[PDB]
């Protein structure tokens, strides 16, 4: 029996699928934020997108399982830059943080990202996560199309729009 | 004198620049929702972002006037699909709404977005605008790079990520 199945079973529908609302509820019940403020609906809708390679708009337990482990790792990284347990990190940390967790980005990019994701000059745990989710999803969709890994993908307007608007 | 000046002057700070929060307050003050619920912060940050092309996270009064005009124009098309002034619209409507917004996308593509922006089955006014705002910003970012107007843009990974993560 999977330690996570209980939470899932609790909100999941008879089809074994949960939506962003339900996801947020069991993520909350799982206590994964562990200390920090539980994630919010919009952030959860994004986690759904990152694992919904179906346009189903829901996820199943195997996915829930995978999500939880990713999230748990990211919270670990974040905590390491949250010396003072504040639930926020500042813009400069984020460049170091983003970099040091499997993300392959140049300094410029990281800074603009750090920028857009700041509220009052700091970046909260929740926003840090949302950033990482969306960052992982888009990199997956990119890699998907970069079938020669040239770090170059020739989008078509419609593909570019649907690809990004759905994440 | 632009009729809009009074609201802007009301919230704008020293240098006549307003951030997402202040924009939220004058769009509200201006009464553009006109019955529907006031836009929430995140949708406003998205607006400020669609207009701020130097990531200062603010806009002047000329930007405010542009936005207001565009917004008001979008709520007009919304208003016609929402006869019962419920405040929402359903997926199948959206496709027709965006088509006549002047967007030019795939029926299939409009569907995935329509799905993604659906909630409880319908799309709220606010999400309708968050969608339009984002669509506008992304089509602008794509055109920029499609100078020979092919309908195709060969993105680099860091440009792609940079472009999308900041909208």
């Amino acid at each position: 029996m999977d330690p996570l199945y209980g939470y899932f079973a609790s909100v999941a529908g008879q089809d074994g699928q949960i939506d962003a609302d339900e996801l947020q509820r069991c993520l909350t019940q799982s206590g994964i934020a562990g200390g920090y403020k539980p994630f919010n609906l919009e952030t959860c809708r994004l986690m759904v997108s990152m694992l919904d390679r179906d346009m189903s708009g829901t996820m199943g337990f195997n996915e829930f399982k995978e999500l939880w482990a990713v999230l748990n790792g990211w919270r670990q990284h974040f905590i390491s830059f949250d010396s003072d347990r504040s639930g926020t990190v500042d813009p400069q940390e984020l460049q170091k943080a983003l970099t040091t967790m499997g993300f392959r980005l140049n300094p410029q990019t990281v800074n603009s990202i750090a920028k857009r994701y700041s509220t009052s000059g700091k970046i909260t745990f929740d926003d840090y996560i949302a950033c990482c989710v969306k960052l992982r999803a888009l990199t997956d969709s990119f890699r998907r199309r970069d079938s020669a890994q040239q770090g170059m993908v020739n989008f078509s307007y419609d593909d570019f729009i649907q690809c990004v608007m759905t994440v």
Side-chain angles (χ1 to χ4, degrees), chain A residues 5 63 87-88 92 132 135:
Chain A
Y5 188 71
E63 278 109 283
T88 70
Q92 301 99 126
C132 299
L135 256 183

Side-chain angles (χ1 to χ4, degrees), chain A residues 6 16 30 35 49 72 109 126 156:
Chain A
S30 81
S49 296
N72 178 56
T109 301
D126 185 287
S156 93

Side-chain angles (χ1 to χ4, degrees), chain A residues 153-164:
Chain A
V153 169
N154 186 57
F155 287 76
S156 93
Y157 171 64
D158 260 284
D159 178 33
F160 170 79
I161 286 295
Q162 142 223 295
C163 173
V164 318

